[PDB]
Design an enzyme around this catalytic site. Structure first.
Site, short mmCIF file in Angstrom:
data_model
loop_
_atom_site.label_atom_id
_atom_site.label_comp_id
_atom_site.label_asym_id
_atom_site.label_seq_id
_atom_site.Cartn_x
_atom_site.Cartn_y
_atom_site.Cartn_z
N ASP A 109 -6.84 -43.19 102.83
CA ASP A 109 -8.08 -43.25 103.61
C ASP A 109 -7.78 -43.12 105.11
OD1 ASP A 109 -10.88 -43.36 103.08
OD2 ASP A 109 -10.99 -45.44 103.82
N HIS A 123 -13.76 -36.26 103.94
CA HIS A 123 -14.76 -37.14 103.33
C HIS A 123 -15.81 -36.38 102.53
CE1 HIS A 123 -13.01 -40.76 105.00
NE2 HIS A 123 -13.93 -41.47 104.36
N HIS A 142 -14.06 -35.48 99.39
CA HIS A 142 -14.07 -36.74 98.60
C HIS A 142 -15.39 -36.90 97.81
CE1 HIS A 142 -15.79 -40.84 98.43
NE2 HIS A 142 -14.64 -41.18 97.88
N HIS A 167 -10.98 -44.58 96.35
CA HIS A 167 -11.57 -43.86 97.48
C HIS A 167 -10.50 -43.16 98.32
CE1 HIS A 167 -15.02 -43.43 100.40
NE2 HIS A 167 -14.02 -43.36 101.26
#
Length: 366
Positions: free
Chosen positions: A171, A254, A257, A271
């Site tokens: 992350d 992101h 993602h 995540h």
């Protein structure tokens, strides 16, 4: 033309910090409402209770049901008003922390978030992710303020499985590249303006800290031990990456993602593990230098982060499915449009599949 950087009012880190929880809640109010689920109540309940020795009317524990939903938020708001609480504390994972932030917003009281893991950059952010009671995504609740205090008990955090700390490195890995892209594009951040020099500097330090410290931190955290490397990584995973992404900008990693949710096999991945692969895809998309790509792939292999679709559980490249991933990544208000060039689903499809090829290539070569 406005630049904005936002922050928690205080970010506090050290071993056994929960044992001083009463000292921190006392700075904000007379009566704390402390939210935690079943597991975390058993884990830290004694430490919290012992922190309030001689102050025993200055807190109450409340059992969290485990889901950050509107009914559960309303239930806890009522309990909090009923107990006359003037400060709310969340202790645990993201769902607990977000519930506490929501409660502080609705009851208009200051908030303390105390993560028991360091696996995402969400804790410092002015954001609660709300779900329906059945577990499906409902909405993004944007808060007027970042939580008042963020408290990192590194001793408690080190007791978590190392996979979670590593996922936080994944992350954190995206933060500099996404912020760099956004600043290059002259686009705006979740903080609501253009990118400050402070935020890009913190994002850059975040990346540098992962490269220098991640492996040393992993080797300690695998044995549930706290070294100064673990301390630096916890700060990088939480404060540096938190301010860096929220006040520096999100971008393709992101968005990619989010698009990966289409692939059902990737739901078992955390995540930050998926963000790590999304970062590689961003680097292909912007065509970062091969030296920059090699440094990222090398770091990911050293700590056990995924660099292929295979590493995310995807056994077969399916064109139809991967197109849907790309299409979802490019949906209307997605963060992928903070890239300083035009983006299309074809281009994102190309970045994803080529990121997978680059990852396979370096795994075989090294």
């Amino acid at each position: 033309m406005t630049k904005i950087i936002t922050s928690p009012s205080k970010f506090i880190q050290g071993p056994d910090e929960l044992s001083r929880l009463s000292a921190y809640t006392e700075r904000l109010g007379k009566k704390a409402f402390i939210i935690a689920d079943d597991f975390v109540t058993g884990l830290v309940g004694k430490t919290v209770e012992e922190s309030y020795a001689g102050k025993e009317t200055g807190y109450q524990m409340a059992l969290f049901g485990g889901e950050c939903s509107k009914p559960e938020i309303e239930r806890l708001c009522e309990m909090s008003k009923s107990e006359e609480a003037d400060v709310v504390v969340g202790i645990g994972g993201g769902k607990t922390l977000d519930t506490a932030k929501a409660v502080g917003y609705y009851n208009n009281i200051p908030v303390i978030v105390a993560p028991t893991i360091a696996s995402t950059n969400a804790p410092t952010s002015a954001l609660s992710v709300i779900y329906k009671e059945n577990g499906e995504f409902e909405e993004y609740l944007m808060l007027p303020l970042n939580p008042t205090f963020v408290i990192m008990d590194t001793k408690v955090i080190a007791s978590a499985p190392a996979r979670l700390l590593v996922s936080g490195m994944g992350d954190a890995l995206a933060t500099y590249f996404e912020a760099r892209a956004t600043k290059r594009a002259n686009k705006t951040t979740m903080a609501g303006g253009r990118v400050t020099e402070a935020a890009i500097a913190l994002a850059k330090l975040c990346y540098d800290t992962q490269i220098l410290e991640g492996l040393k931190a992993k080797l300690a955290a695998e044995k549930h031990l706290v070294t100064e490397a673990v301390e630096k990584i916890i700060e990088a995973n939480t404060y540096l990456s938190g301010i860096g992404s929220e006040s520096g900008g999100l971008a393709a990693a992101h968005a990619i993602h989010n698009g990966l949710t289409v692939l059902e096999e990737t739901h078992h991945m955390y995540h930050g593990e998926k963000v790590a692969f999304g970062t590689l895809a961003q680097l292909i998309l912007e065509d970062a230098p091969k030296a920059e790509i090699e440094e990222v792939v090398s770091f990911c292999l050293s700590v056990g982060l995924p660099v292929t679709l295979g590493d995310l559980g995807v056994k077969e490249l399916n064109e139809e499915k991967l197109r849907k991933v790309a299409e979802l990544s490019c949906a209307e208000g997605e963060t992928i449009y903070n890239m300083p060039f035009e983006v299309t689903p074809d281009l994102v499809y190309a970045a994803i599949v080529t990121a997978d090829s680059v990852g396979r290539y370096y795994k075989e070569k090294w």
